[PDB]
Amino acid sequence: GKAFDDGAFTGIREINLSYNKETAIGDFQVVYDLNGSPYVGQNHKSFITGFTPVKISLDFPSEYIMEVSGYTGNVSGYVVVRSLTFKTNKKTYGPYGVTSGTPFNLPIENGLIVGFKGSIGYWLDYFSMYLSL
Amino acid sequence: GKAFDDGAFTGIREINLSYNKETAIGDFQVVYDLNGSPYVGQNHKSFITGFTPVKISLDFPSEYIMEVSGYTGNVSGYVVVRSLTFKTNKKTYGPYGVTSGTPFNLPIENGLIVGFKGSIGYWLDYFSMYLSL
Amino acid sequence: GKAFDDGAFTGIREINLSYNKETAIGDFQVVYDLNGSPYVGQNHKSFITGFTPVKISLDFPSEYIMEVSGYTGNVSGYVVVRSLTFKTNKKTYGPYGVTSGTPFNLPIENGLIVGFKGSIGYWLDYFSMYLSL
């Protein structure tokens, strides 16, 4: 797919992703906080369309992600991120996509997710997260 | 004067300030780096004019500030920053302004200046710096 | 189990743990680096005996952990960490214990593991890791 790297910001205000209940995660766009002001990140899009869009709007500053979990598995021969779940200190958003394959989870006791990087082709191939205090 | 706070970023690419060889530092603006992209900071201007502008264009990523120094003194009844000097790993920029008063300096052995905050009336009243690895 | 929290240090020099190929991880002890000096961490000991010792000696400073993975599973009704694997930039140590249950993994693109906290009863109940630049 096409690699992307948003870099690090001040926090997260909103996450816009898309998925298909039969395949995996497709598009991914984040609205970050940048020193108290919203910063609209690039919308990293799939090479194909036909996904279901989802908007996760957080009550920034009080609400923040405490755990990110999901599943990775094969779709048409490619290992991709099939599902994503975001758990904040207020609610659990998810699961979006297909909860099949091998699980992964990143719970955070202290610190914040302040950015994302990864790659997306037909689907979200892989991703990493920037962590900070 | 009027306070400003640019917040924190990824680095510094250019500093645009103005000074008067008879008084003190006037205008102050910074072009930061925001994850690989130039971020044009707001131009914090003096309430008056008559200043000589200076452009400090750093060879970002290889060049970065290692020491900030200057002089604080009394100008027309106010304590302001009269002079400023920026030392990088490649060159020394300045002194800009009037080298009169009480000198101050902030040398950095490890880390980077990633943002500025302060206040400006007729002149630069005071300022602080965000530091990060 | 009994909770433990070593805190944060400068790096990791050696890890001493014990396991049983039929159950799970038992004892856990770390020799950290504390500003250039080995810091012998407290030995967090299982409530029971019968484990097999393993000493993971790293070529601190050049060798450092890049990924920690393992499995969590059911043993006698208790959910515990059954297996652990440490991957450094030089070699893979493990798997130690039983590779059965729900997998988990923490790969690190940038940063270092500088401390461990968790709980150990008959076996390692759970654990968390301190990360820093």
Binding site: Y126, F127 | - | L133
Partner: peptide, 17 residues
């Protein structure tokens, strides 16, 4: 270097390397 750093964990998904 003059670029600020941050801890980064991952990647999860397809093998990158």
């Amino acid at each position: 270097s003059g670029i600020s750093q941050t801890v980064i964990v991952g990647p999860w998904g397809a093998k990158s390397a």
